[PDB]
């Protein structure tokens, strides 16, 4: 729908270019299908659309504002920890949906490129592998009881490994 989140290259089709002096049953069946099925269906949907527009109603998104993270939180203060764990779990669900979006992009690219996919579907491939490695360095080796504190301990161990690495000249 939003073609910046869900990009779709334009469906360039070749002109028919026929050689036979003979008919194609596809096209005339398409005409019949249109003037039989698509016309009453479009009538019904236009009716339903104008009846929506008679009494239109709106809904919103609930922007959630940021909160003191758990690193700014004291050992034992259960209220701050609760709020921080909640915003973490929120971001976690959002990250899963991001990963789903990128997997969807990858699959759709694979299908449209079809056979010649392993040369011109590498962009979405790398955009999948990078975010995958992020998720792996962010949420992977936890368990069912994941939490902000566990992700933080993981990040801290990894930063320690990186410090010990860059210690080497």
């Amino acid at each position: 729908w939003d073609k910046d989140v869900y990009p779709e290259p334009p469906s360039r089709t070749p002109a028919p270019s026929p050689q036979t002096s003979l008919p194609n049953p596809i096209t005339y069946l398409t005409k019949a299908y249109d003037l039989v099925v698509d016309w009453p269906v479009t009538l019904v949907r236009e009716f339903i659309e104008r009846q929506h527009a008679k009494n239109r109603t709106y809904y919103y998104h609930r922007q959630y504002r940021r909160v003191p993270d758990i690193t700014e939180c004291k050992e034992g203060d259960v209220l701050c920890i609760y709020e921080a764990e909640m915003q973490w779990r929120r971001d976690f669900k959002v990250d899963q949906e991001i990963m789903n979006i990128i997997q969807e992009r990858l699959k759709a690219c694979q299908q449209r490129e079809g056979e010649n996919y392993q040369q011109n579907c590498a962009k979405e491939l790398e955009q999948f592998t990078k975010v995958t490695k992020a998720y792996q360095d962010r949420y992977l080796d936890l368990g069912a009881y994941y939490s902000a504190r566990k992700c933080l301990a993981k990040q801290k161990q990894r930063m320690l490994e990186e410090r010990k690495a860059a210690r080497q000249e």
């Binding site: 034992g76 259960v78 209220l79 609760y82 709020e83 909640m86």
Partner: protein, 63 residues
Amino acid sequence: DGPEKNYEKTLAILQIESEKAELRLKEQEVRRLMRARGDGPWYQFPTPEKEFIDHSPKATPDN
């Protein structure tokens, strides 16, 4: 009603139970100190009564 109710009611319950934990552990250490040393109102074990002593003049001086 909405999410604010649940969120903030949870926060109330959390402060309640955290305070209760604090006070339970405090009560434990308090009882420990009061029993190890009788500085406090509790665990003050009884002593002999003072008012039933006779202070009057006796039959001998070196009572």
